[PDB]
Design an enzyme around this catalytic site. Structure first.
Site, PDB file in Angstrom:
ATOM      1  N   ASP A   1      -1.792  -1.895  -8.331  1.00 42.19           N
ATOM      2  CA  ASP A   1      -2.740  -3.079  -8.043  1.00 42.19           C
ATOM      3  C   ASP A   1      -4.080  -3.159  -8.649  1.00 42.19           C
ATOM      4  O   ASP A   1      -5.202  -2.683  -8.998  1.00 42.19           O
ATOM      5  CB  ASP A   1      -3.350  -1.706  -6.802  1.00 42.19           C
ATOM      6  CG  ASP A   1      -4.027  -2.536  -5.648  1.00 42.19           C
ATOM      7  OD1 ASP A   1      -5.265  -1.954  -5.584  1.00 42.19           O
ATOM      8  OD2 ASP A   1      -3.058  -2.851  -4.842  1.00 42.19           O
TER       9      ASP A   1
ATOM     10  N   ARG B   1       0.833  -0.923   0.312  1.00 40.11           N
ATOM     11  CA  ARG B   1       0.080   0.055  -0.100  1.00 40.11           C
ATOM     12  C   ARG B   1       1.029   1.330   0.003  1.00 40.11           C
ATOM     13  O   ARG B   1       1.221   2.035   1.351  1.00 40.11           O
ATOM     14  CB  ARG B   1      -0.627   0.095   1.075  1.00 40.11           C
ATOM     15  CG  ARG B   1      -1.820  -1.355   0.840  1.00 40.11           C
ATOM     16  CD  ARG B   1      -3.095  -1.147   1.192  1.00 40.11           C
ATOM     17  NE  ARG B   1      -3.336  -0.899  -0.475  1.00 40.11           N
ATOM     18  CZ  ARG B   1      -4.251  -0.095  -0.845  1.00 40.11           C
ATOM     19  NH1 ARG B   1      -5.301   0.467  -0.310  1.00 40.11           N
ATOM     20  NH2 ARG B   1      -4.320   0.610  -2.669  1.00 40.11           N
TER      21      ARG B   1
ATOM     22  N   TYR C   1      -6.849   0.872   5.835  1.00 37.07           N
ATOM     23  CA  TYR C   1      -7.653   0.397   5.378  1.00 37.07           C
ATOM     24  C   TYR C   1      -8.698   0.488   7.082  1.00 37.07           C
ATOM     25  O   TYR C   1      -7.840   1.509   8.019  1.00 37.07           O
ATOM     26  CB  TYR C   1      -7.321  -1.295   5.854  1.00 37.07           C
ATOM     27  CG  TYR C   1      -7.501  -1.741   4.791  1.00 37.07           C
ATOM     28  CD1 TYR C   1      -5.622  -2.081   4.619  1.00 37.07           C
ATOM     29  CD2 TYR C   1      -8.051  -1.833   3.399  1.00 37.07           C
ATOM     30  CE1 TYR C   1      -5.405  -2.064   3.169  1.00 37.07           C
ATOM     31  CE2 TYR C   1      -7.246  -2.586   2.076  1.00 37.07           C
ATOM     32  CZ  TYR C   1      -5.992  -2.723   2.247  1.00 37.07           C
ATOM     33  OH  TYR C   1      -5.352  -2.756   1.116  1.00 37.07           O
TER      34      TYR C   1
ATOM     35  N   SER D   1      -7.648  -2.432  -6.116  1.00 37.25           N
ATOM     36  CA  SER D   1      -8.195  -1.131  -7.050  1.00 37.25           C
ATOM     37  C   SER D   1      -9.000  -1.248  -7.836  1.00 37.25           C
ATOM     38  O   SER D   1     -10.171  -0.655  -8.682  1.00 37.25           O
ATOM     39  CB  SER D   1      -7.679  -0.183  -6.722  1.00 37.25           C
ATOM     40  OG  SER D   1      -6.310   0.113  -7.823  1.00 37.25           O
TER      41      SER D   1
ATOM     42  N   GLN E   1       0.167   1.907  -7.350  1.00 36.13           N
ATOM     43  CA  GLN E   1      -1.201   2.428  -7.330  1.00 36.13           C
ATOM     44  C   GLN E   1      -1.076   2.273  -8.786  1.00 36.13           C
ATOM     45  O   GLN E   1      -2.834   1.086  -8.925  1.00 36.13           O
ATOM     46  CB  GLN E   1      -2.067   3.687  -6.886  1.00 36.13           C
ATOM     47  CG  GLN E   1      -2.089   4.072  -5.819  1.00 36.13           C
ATOM     48  CD  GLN E   1      -2.977   3.298  -5.340  1.00 36.13           C
ATOM     49  OE1 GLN E   1      -3.563   2.108  -4.698  1.00 36.13           O
ATOM     50  NE2 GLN E   1      -4.607   3.719  -5.751  1.00 36.13           N
TER      51      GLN E   1
END
Ligand SMILES: NC(=O)c1ccc[n+]([C@@H]2O[C@H](COP(=O)([O-])OP(=O)(O)OC[C@H]3O[C@@H](n4cnc5c(N)ncnc54)[C@H](O)[C@@H]3O)[C@@H](O)[C@H]2O)c1
Ligand SMILES: NC(=O)c1ccc[n+]([C@@H]2O[C@H](COP(=O)([O-])OP(=O)(O)OC[C@H]3O[C@@H](n4cnc5c(N)ncnc54)[C@H](O)[C@@H]3O)[C@@H](O)[C@H]2O)c1
Lengths: 375, 382
Positions: free
Chosen positions: A135, A127, A235, A138, A132
């Site tokens: 990932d 994370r 989270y 997501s 990003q």
């Protein structure tokens, strides 16, 4: 080097871990790209389109994977105990990149370890902001949140937008999104553009502003408690029964008026939080629908059943499995790009050498050279 | 006077010709309102909601209609020949208001006439501006156009809107709407709401500005080629036009993801707008929603009630599309009926005098007091 992409064999899996646009990038990097004949049918990606991009089409899975140095796929390979040994088709010492479900599926990791395969479990992507674009959780979640609203609208017997006609006015759909993570935000956006009045709740305080900027109404439960509800990974934390009772009372006021409730909450390594109890569905209006996107993780609603639409108390409780595959033609190119972005940095000026010190590589690697890394 | 509404019994019909709000108005006009139990289940309208509005609940259809002076329903009542003689339940001399399918269903008109029932065929509502609030074709069509986009999006494996993710961007879907009447206009608005790229085409020139007003793009064919008839209706343009319209459409149709066809022609089979040949040229994964399927379809591959898969394309041809939106369709159909009836009510006398000189009355009455009124319905019994 050869990279191969087989057809997804698990039941209902329509996604494929490739796209023509990714094939061209791979070929440009020096790879021989092999894809099993018909792997992209569910995603509307033809064999000819892959060939035009530079790919080689193999007639069978075994032939596609036989000499591959790198194997890309969507779901974890099936094992001998499941009836079809896909692990045995992977060359010993090869690299595998996919959603392995490693933390929940030890026997697949063990089977890979026996063939000395290096497996990168894409769902464990660290994370960190620079990861990003790599990932898969997501990119797939984003599509699932959109899909929830489409499935909700399909099962609902009124239109989403408020309509003002010569015959009269019909009110809009009222939508409530429980859990405003990646899926929940796309659910809000999709429902809002369709014309619905959208409400939403989450334990994380950072979520409030994201909801409001999309034009949703945030349901405040425990203002100050929200302050400490987020982890360092982004989270939510386990909240407790006292909050549970609070949440219910705040939510119920809007839930009794809700037409479509979309539930997306997850807790790392735990069963999904119960957000809509059976008692609560009893207070809902006849004709209402619940889209439980957390159904495979236990469901946020105890009445939801995986792969089914359950009808109870006049409410449809929708719990489709593998929601990303219900948007397979968009899901595949994005999943393919996630894999390309993860692998690209390790090719140079022309071979592929995974830099083991890279945090995305060490964080994702679950087994390598016969040794289990992250137990 | 008593007004009664039964449960719809034709296969697949979930609409009901009533709503709590309309019950209140009817009671406010001096009516006793009776609805058969469970009539609104399909539309999410409970008996309790109707009772709280002032209506009474009847245990059976026969108990509901036996004393009714006025009967409202959605589809035409079934006859003895169809398995359930619904017209036999209607009191002799009563007034019936519904979608009668009058110009295409002789048996029902004969049965009604035999019992001296005065029937107003709501589907014949004159196309005058003051009757727009009474028009069941447009209220129902508007919801069908919305539903075509939802059914299309449900059957398509890509998202409608452009989505900008960290993984990359996914392009918007492309929608081509054929026929820009009431249904087509709503399909455009709903597809635009969902962020789709929308193209549209119609034989009526005036449609172009309506398409552009919603942000869509019009596919011109023959600017010069008198299309709108007096009722705001289109037509049978000739083979010449049909070949020419196919040409420009192909260029967009080859990149289209969802084609929604809605074209109809008064008193004729639906025009063929997407040939089998043309579906062959679409991308695999594409979806065609043929809203004209019941009139023969705008695409020859559509089949009533089915989703046909051919050439990698889903050809969707659901029947009774308005009923897929029954909980919104019912209140609007009920208001159409209320808007048509209200002007003729005399509260103090508690009488229903349908003014004969009223254009909506004369345009819609097909039979009255045992004598056929609509000129096309005269004839011999079967
Ligand atoms: C990005 O994504 C990060 C994580 O999002 P994600 O989609 O991967 O999360 P996720 O899939 O793990 O969970 C989805 C959402 O559920 C919420 N949630 C968890 N328990 C809940 C509860 N009891 N009640 C209400 N909501 C609850 C979470 O806070 C999260 O926003 C965030 O930092 C955001 O900025
Ligand atoms: N529905 C009604 O009874 C009603 C009442 C009042 C006013 N109007 C107006 O009348 C007009 C017609 O709308 P509608 O919904 O009743 O139409 P419709 O259902 O009869 O037809 C749908 C559309 O298909 C078009 N069409 C016919 N043949 C075509 C072909 N070959 N290619 C492409 N398009 C073709 C028509 O021009 C029409 O616009 C609109 O302006 C509507 O607002 C309709």
């Amino acid at each position: 080097m050869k990279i191969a992409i087989p057809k997804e064999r698990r039941p209902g899996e329509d996604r494929v871990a490739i796209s023509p646009e990714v094939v061209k990038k791979l070929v440009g990097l020096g790879f021989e790209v092999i894809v099993e004949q018909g792997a992209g049918v569910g995603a509307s990606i033809t064999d000819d389109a892959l060939t035009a991009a530079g790919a080689t089409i193999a007639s069978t899975a075994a032939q596609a994977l036989s000499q591959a140095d790198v194997v890309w796929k969507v779901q974890r390979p099936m094992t001998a105990e499941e009836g079809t040994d896909e692990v045995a088709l992977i060359k010993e010492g090869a690299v595998l990149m996919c959603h392995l479900g490693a933390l929940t599926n030890r026997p697949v990791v063990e089977a890979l370890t026996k063939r000395k395969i290096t497996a990168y479990a894409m769902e464990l992507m660290p994370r960190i902001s620079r990861a990003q674009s790599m990932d898969i959780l997501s990119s797939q979640s984003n599509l699932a949140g959109y899909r929830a609203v489409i499935d909700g609208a399909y099962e609902f017997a009124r239109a989403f937008p408020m309509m003002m006609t010569a015959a009269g006015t019909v009110p809009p759909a009222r939508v409530l999104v429980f859990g405003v993570g990646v899926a929940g935000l796309q659910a809000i956006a999709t429902a809002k553009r369709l014309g619905a009045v959208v409400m939403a709740t989450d334990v994380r305080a950072a979520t409030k502003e994201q909801v409001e900027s999309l034009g949703g109404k945030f349901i405040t439960v425990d203002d100050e408690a929200m302050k400490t509800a987020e982890t360092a990974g982004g989270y939510a934390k386990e909240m407790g029964e006292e909050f549970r009772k609070k949440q219910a009372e705040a939510v119920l006021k809007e839930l009794v008026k809700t037409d479509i409730a979309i539930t997306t909450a997850l807790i790392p390594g735990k069963p999904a939080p119960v957000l809509i109890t059976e008692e609560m569905v009893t207070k809902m209006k006849p004709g209402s629908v619940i889209i439980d996107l957390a159904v495979e993780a236990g469901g946020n609603c105890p009445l939801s059943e995986p792969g089914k639409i359950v009808v109870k108390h006049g409410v449809k409780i929708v719990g489709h499995t593998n929601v990303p595959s219900r948007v397979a033609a968009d899901a595949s190119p994005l999943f393919a790009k996630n894999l390309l972005n993860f692998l690209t940095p390790h090719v140079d000026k022309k071979t592929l050498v995974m830099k083991l010190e890279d945090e995305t590589v060490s964080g994702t690697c679950v087994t390598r050279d016969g040794a289990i890394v992250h137990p």
